Design a protein around this ligand. Structure first.
Ligand code: NAG
Lengths: 44, 49
């Protein structure tokens, strides 16, 4: 998860690839206090 | 370490509630081997060999 200046955005694990966020590239996970949170730029 | 515990089969919950005690267990595990640098460490024996 990398934020650009043209927003948090998906990239691959082996190249600087700027891509948007979809459901086809992530998984779900349990809550954890140790990271960040957003309220308006919600990924689908 | 936390993600390592997630990978090996320890859930996020129990590590999220038992940070300090497993930390101290890791510390004493690291400290016990310090004074053990003797014949009891077989690798120490092999290096001397
Ligand atoms: C949401 O993310 C922020 C930023 O990392 C963090 O400070 C906060 O604790 C998170 N929320 C919860 C409920 O942990």
């Amino acid at each position: 998860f990398i934020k650009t200046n043209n927003e948090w955005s998906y990239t691959g694990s082996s190249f600087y690839a700027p891509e948007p966020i979809t459901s086809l590239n992530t998984k779900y996970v349990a809550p954890q206090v140790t990271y960040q949170n957003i309220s308006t730029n919600l990924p689908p | 370490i936390f993600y390592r515990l997630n990978g090996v089969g320890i859930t996020q919950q129990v590590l999220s509630e038992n940070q300090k005690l497993i930390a101290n267990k890791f510390n004493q595990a690291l400290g016990a081997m310090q004074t053990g640098f003797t014949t009891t460490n077989e690798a120490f024996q092999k290096v001397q060999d």
